[PDB]
Design a protein around this nucleic acid. Structure first.
Lengths: 37, 144, 175, 136, 17
RNA sequence: GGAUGUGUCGUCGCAUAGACAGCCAGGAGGUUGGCUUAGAAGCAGCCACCCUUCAAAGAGUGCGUAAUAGCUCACUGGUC
């Protein structure tokens, strides 16, 4: 997981989702898995 | 040594034998004899001596293997056709040279079983783009 | 453009999407107040070499050319405008844009052609037929080719107000 | 960067842009949307960044030179007069101003030549293009 | 510049036949 | 600084003569483009990015290898 303050796409798979009051990044590629929190 | 097949392409030079960097393991590591290639292939490389013709291969297994030769490099004879034995850094700022359409007749006369284009003009302008970006000019043409 | 009001008080618009101009010649210098958007979608094209219908509320079609617009800082948004009622046989002098065309023998070469002077003002245009542009050659231009006003062909009649020898464009080198 | 010769010191105050046109020298340009003090070394930070993204053409204009000396704490004290003529040099940008405006590269090869160049400035800026025809 | 099985132009590659 | 969180105004846009997202199927030959390299073949980096056929398929998205290869894209048709 990548908790970064600036969460943004990294390839055409980075599906920016809004789970519980949080901004995330589910990407086919995991190292792309981001999450502000 | 076993039963495994499929296909594998390559680009071994014309009148030149392959030591270990062209084949050796390359396709040798599949149950295929090179010695029985350094001669079979480099035999027909004779008519087309002086170049790197492209050659497909085809594996069955055991000690089995085929091959089909194609058209060689026409970059060689061209260099020889303007006195320069090494391509140009920038083909559009510093060009190599210029030619005539005549030798262009034979071009499409060897590259035929490859060229699937329409009629004549078809492949008459295909080689243009090639000639175009290597580093040479098109002599004659429309009107005039 | 259907501007209607023209009082000294712009309240009734400053909020309501509406620009505020003024136009004249020497005769009438009527007060004005047209629609933001309209003009916003308007001036774009015609720029300052573009005259348009000015039927101020009441039905009195007028002819004028974009004089000087002074837009907001902090906001590319425009606020005030100036229209110079078209004349008939002479408006004054105009400001005309320099344009390039056809790949230059400099671009591919090894450099990039630069337009030293963007728009250019020429003495006398001739109202009724005033160049809303000005295409220009560039191709010939090579390794440091300057093109001055005393080069660019002229639109039958118009005279160059700008000094001729003045570099209107020039192919710039690499790096 | 630094000015060549001068007087030495200064003061400090503010009011929005006054002489930061728009188009001029280019087709694309960057504008600052907040009252700041551009440190010369924060300009280099741009220029260079901007360069990299481009290879040649060098159609980058920095129309915001640093006419302004700032100062510093010699270490702590207080008992002495004004100080540090040489802390660094600043160029006061004001809203609407134009620090940058590349020209020649693709609309896109221009919207990145700034994006980055904007990530190292103390304020917020937006890019701009044309219809800029005041004086010429 | 060296290896076993692994290049195209100097001379190593891999190995068998 | 970031994000298909909502409310409202503006711009392109692209479109039943049947798009977008979904789906089955395709995908070009020149060419491992020329250039460069110990080699790099749409994909480390200069130059360009033309030709032929077609309903089509761009010397080219990214992943991938020592390059090959393999895997999809942009372009095309039917099903709604």
């Amino acid at each position: 997981m990548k908790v970064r303050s600036s969460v943004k796409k990294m390839c055409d798979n980075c599906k920016v989702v809004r789970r519980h009051g949080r901004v995330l990044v589910i990407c086919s590629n995991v190292k792309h898995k981001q999450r502000q929190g | 040594m076993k039963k495994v097949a499929g296909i594998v392409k390559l680009q071994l030079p014309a009148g030149k034998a392959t030591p270990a960097p062209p084949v050796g393991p390359a396709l040798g590591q599949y149950g295929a004899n090179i010695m029985e290639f350094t001669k079979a292939f480099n035999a027909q490389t004779a008519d087309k001596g002086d170049a790197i013709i492209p050659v497909e291969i085809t594996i069955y297994a055991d000690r089995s293997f085929t091959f089909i030769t194609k058209t060689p490099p026409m970059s060689y004879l061209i260099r020889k056709a303007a006195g320069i034995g090494k391509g140009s850094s920038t083909p559009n700022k510093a060009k190599v040279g210029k030619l005539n359409w005549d030798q262009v007749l034979e071009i499409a006369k060897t590259k035929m079983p490859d060229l699937n284009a329409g009629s004549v003009e078809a492949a008459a302008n295909t080689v243009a783009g090639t000639a175009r970006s290597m580093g040479v000019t098109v002599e004659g043409g429309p009107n005039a | 453009m259907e501007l209607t009001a023209k009082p000294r008080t712009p309240k009734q618009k400053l909020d309501e999407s509406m620009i505020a101009a003024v136009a004249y010649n020497k005769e009438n210098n009527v007060s004005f107040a047209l629609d933001r958007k309209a003009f916003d979608r308007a001036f774009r094209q015609q720029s300052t070499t573009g005259l348009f219908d000015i039927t101020v509320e009441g039905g009195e079609t007028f002819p004028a050319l974009v004089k000087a617009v002074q837009m907001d800082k902090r906001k590319r948004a425009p606020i005030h405008v100036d229209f110079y009622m078209v004349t008939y046989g002479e408006p004054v002098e105009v400001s005309v844009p320099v344009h390039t065309t056809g790949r230059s023998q400099g671009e591919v070469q090894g450099g990039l052609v630069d337009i030293v002077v963007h728009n250019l003002q020429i003495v006398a245009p001739g109202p009724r037929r005033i160049p809303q542009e000005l295409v220009v050659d560039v191709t010939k231009m090579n390794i440091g080719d300057h093109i001055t006003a005393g080069d660019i062909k002229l639109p039958e009649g118009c005279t160059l107000a700008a000094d001729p020898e003045l570099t209107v464009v020039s192919v710039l080198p690499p790096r | 960067k630094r000015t060549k010769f001068r007087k030495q010191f200064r003061g400090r105050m503010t009011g929005d842009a006054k002489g930061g046109d728009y188009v001029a020298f280019g087709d694309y340009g960057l504008i600052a949307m907040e009252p700041a003090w551009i440190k010369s070394n924060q300009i280099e930070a741009c220029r260079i960044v901007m360069s990299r993204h481009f290879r040649r053409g060098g159609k980058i204009y920095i129309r915001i030179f640093p006419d302004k000396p700032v100062t510093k704490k010699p270490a702590e004290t207080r008992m002495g007069k004004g100080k540090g003529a040489v802390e660094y040099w600043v160029s006061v940008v004001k809203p609407g101003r134009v620090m940058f405006e590349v020209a020649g590269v693709t609309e896109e090869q221009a919207k990145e030549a700034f994006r980055l160049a904007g990530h190292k400035l103390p304020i917020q800026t937006k890019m701009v293009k044309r219809e800029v025809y005041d004086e010429a | 510049i060296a290896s076993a099985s692994c290049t195209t132009x100097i001379c190593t590659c891999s190995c068998s036949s």
